[PDB]
Write an enzyme that holds these catalytic residues in place. Structure first.
Site, mmCIF file in Angstrom:
data_model
loop_
_atom_site.group_PDB
_atom_site.id
_atom_site.type_symbol
_atom_site.label_atom_id
_atom_site.label_comp_id
_atom_site.label_asym_id
_atom_site.label_seq_id
_atom_site.Cartn_x
_atom_site.Cartn_y
_atom_site.Cartn_z
ATOM 1 N N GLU A 1 32.571 49.821 54.795
ATOM 2 C CA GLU A 1 33.236 50.551 55.830
ATOM 3 C C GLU A 1 34.012 51.692 55.150
ATOM 4 O O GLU A 1 34.636 51.489 54.098
ATOM 5 C CB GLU A 1 34.177 49.572 56.525
ATOM 6 C CG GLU A 1 34.992 50.169 57.600
ATOM 7 C CD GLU A 1 35.861 49.150 58.309
ATOM 8 O OE1 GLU A 1 35.355 48.050 58.644
ATOM 9 O OE2 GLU A 1 37.041 49.485 58.568
ATOM 10 N N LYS B 1 32.599 51.082 63.245
ATOM 11 C CA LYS B 1 32.405 51.005 61.803
ATOM 12 C C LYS B 1 32.221 49.607 61.280
ATOM 13 O O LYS B 1 31.311 49.338 60.499
ATOM 14 C CB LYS B 1 33.649 51.510 61.051
ATOM 15 C CG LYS B 1 33.865 52.968 60.944
ATOM 16 C CD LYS B 1 35.160 53.211 60.149
ATOM 17 C CE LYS B 1 36.389 52.804 60.955
ATOM 18 N NZ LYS B 1 37.553 52.710 60.128
ATOM 19 N N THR B 2 33.155 48.738 61.639
ATOM 20 C CA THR B 2 33.138 47.363 61.146
ATOM 21 C C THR B 2 31.917 46.589 61.596
ATOM 22 O O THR B 2 31.271 45.925 60.790
ATOM 23 C CB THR B 2 34.376 46.606 61.562
ATOM 24 O OG1 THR B 2 35.510 47.267 61.010
ATOM 25 C CG2 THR B 2 34.315 45.170 61.028
#
Ligand code: AMP
Length: 465
Positions: free
Chosen positions: A156, A112-113
């Protein structure tokens, strides 16, 4: 609205949001037991930070924002309700930043990040100056978050406690969905999958979902997503397909197959097949938006990464460390799930085939160590030298058999590695220093305290103090 107060303003998540709101001119207040670079920066911007949790801290607040790590007992929260001051969670405030913006929410269990960072770079390069809020420090910007002048918001989306259900984005990405434990109750994992589906259904009907078809759970969920979907992966049936992947040092090289476009050749400034997947996601979103290929390719070749995501902190000489010739390479990774640790090992192995892999690992939580025990032993057995710190409790009471010593026993009993138990955080530098050889690639791996150890190893150039 004028005065926003954050309980736990110093952590990742809370800090970025506070910073964007400061730059938009709102009055900002906060509290945190442990002042850090984020709290200093916030004070620089005009925010009032307290290093204690007292009821007086919430005075005159228009709203109080709280992270899930704060307990209901916190006097700030208690004081807030007494005063009938709305109290919301980090995720509701992120949702408000997204309300009147073109939101691009990046979800998944892993990646995600990084994917949020890759999208932010692409949009910045394309001159679309996006607002972004990421779960990690975006190295190109020196921060977790930044206010942009355009209508775009790249963020995110956290699945923990279904926080992402408050977000109303225009585009959503799902990188993958994986369990971090066996079902305590019948339907535990099915519940988790349903929250991802509910998340994607937050998209308007004209919105777009970008999903990784290589992930078995995501592939299985496609039919249940009643929204326009664009898939990506190495899979043959992917809408955006990766092929001819090869890794050279820290870089990834591959082709991307997209509809109504000829094949494009990509050079990615991030290692591993998993980063190629994250990039494909980013390119899929960028392409639907109409961003030009030159902007995309320049962004990816120049990608600067995020703090603690296969983060190269330096190559340092060993003479002053242990008196040996040569140097050692220091890489910092926060990966805590066995899948994350394995991906990091694969990247290091493929990127530098001749270096010896030395890992200093700190398991995070007893529950997770117990729940994925077998996977940790298998993944950790792949390094050439393993040093293990005691489990970072994160508030949890110990679970017999689910500790670092037990894990060390299981790994040693296989007769290939002889793991080194590091009894202290303060002893880590010395014990690491003692076994380092020239051409070593050190992975300081883990989500808790080990982050500080990495920083200190870099600051002192691997020399014990
Ligand atoms: N697509 C992916 N699949 C599996 N692991 C990943 C992926 N992307 C990143 N990772 C790992 O997860 C950690 C970083 O994830 P994140 O902070 O979400 O980018 C690192 O340990 C990576 O090795």
């Amino acid at each position: 609205v004028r005065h926003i107060h954050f309980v736990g303003i110093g952590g990742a998540g809370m800090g970025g949001i506070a910073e964007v709101l400061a730059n938009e001119g709102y009055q900002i207040s906060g509290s945190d037991l442990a002042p850090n670079s984020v709290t200093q920066h916030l004070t620089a911007l005009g925010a009032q930070i307290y290093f204690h949790h007292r009821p007086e801290n919430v005075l005159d607040a228009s709203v109080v924002v709280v992270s899930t790590a704060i307990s209901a007992d916190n006097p700030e929260i208690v004081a807030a309700r007494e005063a009938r001051i709305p109290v919301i969670r980090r995720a509701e405030m992120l949702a408000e930043l997204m309300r009147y913006r073109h939101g691009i929410a990046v979800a998944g269990t892993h990646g995600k990040t990084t994917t949020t960072a890759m999208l932010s770079s692409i949009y910045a390069e394309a001159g679309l100056d996006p607002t972004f809020v990421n779960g990690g420090l975006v190295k190109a910007a020196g921060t977790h978050a930044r206010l942009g002048s355009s209508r775009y918001l790249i963020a995110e989306a956290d699945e923990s406690d279904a926080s992402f259900l408050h977000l109303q984005p225009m585009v959503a990405i799902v990188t993958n969905i994986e369990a971090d434990h066996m079902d305590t109750y019948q339907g535990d994992f099915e519940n988790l999958k349903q929250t991802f589906i509910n998340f994607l259904h937050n998209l308007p009907f004209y919105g777009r979902a970008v999903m990784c078809i290589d992930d078995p759970v995501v592939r299985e969920l496609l039919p249940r997503v009643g929204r326009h979907i664009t898939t990506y992966g190495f899979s043959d049936d992917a809408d955006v397909q990766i092929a001819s992947y090869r890794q050279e040092g820290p870089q990834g090289h591959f082709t991307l197959r997209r509809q109504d476009k000829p094949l494009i050749e990509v050079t990615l400034n991030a290692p591993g097949r998993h980063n190629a997947l994250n990039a494909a996601a980013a390119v899929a979103v960028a392409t639907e938006e109409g961003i030009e290929d030159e902007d995309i390719l320049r962004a990816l070749v120049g990608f600067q990464g995020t703090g603690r995501r296969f983060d190269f902190l330096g190559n340092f000489p060993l003479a002053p460390v242990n008196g040996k010739e040569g140097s050692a390479m220091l890489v910092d990774d926060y990966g805590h799930h066995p899948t994350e640790v394995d991906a990091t090992i694969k990247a290091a192995r493929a990127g530098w085939p001749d270096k010896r892999i030395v890992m200093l690992f700190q398991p995070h939580r007893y529950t997770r160590t117990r729940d994925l025990y077998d996977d940790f032993a298998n993944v950790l057995s792949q390094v050439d030298v393993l040093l293990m710190l005691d489990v970072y409790a994160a508030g949890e009471p110990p679970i017999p058999g689910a500790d670092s010593r037990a894990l060390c026993r299981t790994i040693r009993n296989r007769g290939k590695l002889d793991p080194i138990l590091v009894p202290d955080s303060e002893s880590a530098p010395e014990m690491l220093a003692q076994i380092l050889n020239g051409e070593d690639l050190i992975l300081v791996q883990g989500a808790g305290n080990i982050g500080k150890i990495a920083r200190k190893l870099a600051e002192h150039k691997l020399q014990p103090q």
